[PDB]
């Protein structure tokens, strides 16, 4: 009857958030983003994106680490796989790129849980947790993984981003604030047995 | 990188839906429902409810089996555990009670996946996929399980219910139609690798 995965959470105060050089997006606008998505689809097919969910707590209240581009959109650490790249090795690479330390000490990322899939049917913003009706060639597949943090870690945040610890109640039913993926993280995390260490 | 659970789905046409005597709710109204919930909380503490998600497909389109009380509210097969009752044995008991055959042939329910948790903080309708802030004594804990169906099965539907096969797109973002639990099932099922048999 214990069919739940057990996940160790540690206090937000256990983690050190340093700073490093800005990390710039490949697209300077939504228009460019969808242009490049069109160009790559015609060369190498469906975009494969991976996103990591990193959880901490304070006073046994779970928080998801989000990356805020200045004071704009919130995103999960993650991004685009290269063609032929393993999903898990790819997320470890992208999370090292985004939050990895300047002193070049290896963070040990542990990824043992897929927590969802999202599909983009067109070169447009709408994404669904399923392939919609009549769609044979989705333009993007996004896969979310739960990342088990070590007890303590040093993270280097690119100077152009803020790292925010978002409590679940704030995500819940707040698609306008966070979009349909991050806003459904409370539902997607409810199945886990969190230890508050 | 295959961290997904693999789930066999079969066609809706593989399953036989017979009929049996009505199965009446213990509460004749929302008011009675919350009254009885108050009375039991003071005797035996937090209500423990279990709900099963049974999935089929037609033409590789996944459908969740819902029970419609006449033409009213949609519910998952499930209900209240007795004090000291195992969650999994309890859901098998409740699903036998609701959909079990009249000829008293055993359905073999396979339950290997928790897909979420919901908490009712007050004797009121609101439920959250987490224990809300300042709540030490939640009044109900609801646990959802994915039920792996056999290739073929005979189900006996109580005459006062309809068994509806609901496609995911219809559930998605339709809390008004289905409430916050069923409406978030597409997100909660997205992590599974469905085989369409
Ligand atoms: C190639 C790369 C690498 C990348 C990831 C991030 C990033 C993701 C999440 C939070 C903060 C930063 N910025 O650049 N460039 C892009 O424009 C998308 C992408 O995958
Ligand atoms: C004790 C019991 C048994 C039960 C379950 C169902 C039922 C659930 C889902 C779909 C269709 C029918 N109706 O009665 N009586 C109640 O009033 C709640 C409960 O747990
Ligand atoms: Zn504390
Ligand atoms: Zn795909
Ligand atoms: Zn077919
Ligand atoms: Zn509980």
UniProtKB/Swiss-Prot annotation, chains A, B:
Residues 3-117 are annotated as: Necessary for RNA-binding. Changing residue 51 to A: Reduces affinity for UGUA RNA by 12%. One of its GO terms (molecular function) is protein homodimerization activity. Coiled coil: none annotated. Keywords: Acetylation, Cytoplasm, Differentiation, Methylation, mRNA processing, Nucleus, Phosphoprotein, RNA-binding. Residues 51-130 are annotated as: Necessary for interactions with PAPOLA and PABPN1. A motif (Nudix box) lies at residues 79-100. One of its GO terms (cellular component) is nuclear body. The modification Phosphotyrosine is found at residue 10. It holds the Pfam family NUDIX_2. Acetylated mainly by p300/CBP, recruited to the complex by CPSF6. Acetylation decreases interaction with PAPAO. Deacetylated by the class I/II HDACs, HDAC1, HDAC3 and HDAC10, and by the class III HDACs, SIRT1 and SIRT2. PANTHER family: PRE-MRNA CLEAVAGE FACTOR IM, 25KD SUBUNIT. Belongs to the Nudix hydrolase family. CPSF5 subfamily. Component of the cleavage factor Im (CFIm) complex that functions as an activator of the pre-mRNA 3'-end cleavage and polyadenylation processing required for the maturation of pre-mRNA into functional mRNAs. CFIm contributes to the recruitment of multiprotein complexes on specific sequences on the pre-mRNA 3'-end, so called cleavage and polyadenylation signals (pA signals). Most pre-mRNAs contain multiple pA signals, resulting in alternative cleavage and polyadenylation (APA) producing mRNAs with variable 3'-end formation. This is Cleavage and polyadenylation specificity factor subunit 5. It comes from Homo sapiens (Human). The gene is NUDT21.
């Amino acid at each position: 009857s214990m069919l739940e995965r057990t996940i160790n959470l540690y206090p937000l105060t256990n983690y050190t958030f340093g700073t490093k050089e800005p990390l710039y997006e490949k697209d300077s606008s939504v228009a460019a983003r969808f242009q490049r998505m069109r160009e790559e689809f015609d060369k190498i097919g469906m975009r494969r994106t991976v996103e990591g969910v990193l959880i901490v707590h304070e006073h046994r209240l779970p928080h998801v680490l989000l990356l805020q581009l200045g004071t704009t959109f919130f995103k999960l650490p993650g991004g685009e796989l290269n063609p032929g790249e393993d999903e898990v090795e790819g997320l470890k690479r992208l999370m090292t790129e985004i939050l990895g330390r300047q002193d070049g000490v290896l963070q040990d990322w542990v990824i043992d849980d897929c927590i969802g899939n999202w599909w983009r049917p067109n070169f447009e913003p709408p994404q669904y947790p399923y392939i919609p009706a009549h769609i044979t060639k989705p333009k993007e597949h996004k896969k979310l993984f739960l990342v088990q943090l070590q007890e303590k870690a040093l993270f280097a945040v690119p100077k152009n981003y803020k790292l925010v610890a978002a409590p679940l109640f704030e995500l819940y039913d707040n698609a306008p604030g966070y979009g349909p993926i991050i806003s459904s993280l409370p539902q997607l995390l409810s199945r886990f047995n969190f230890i508050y260490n």
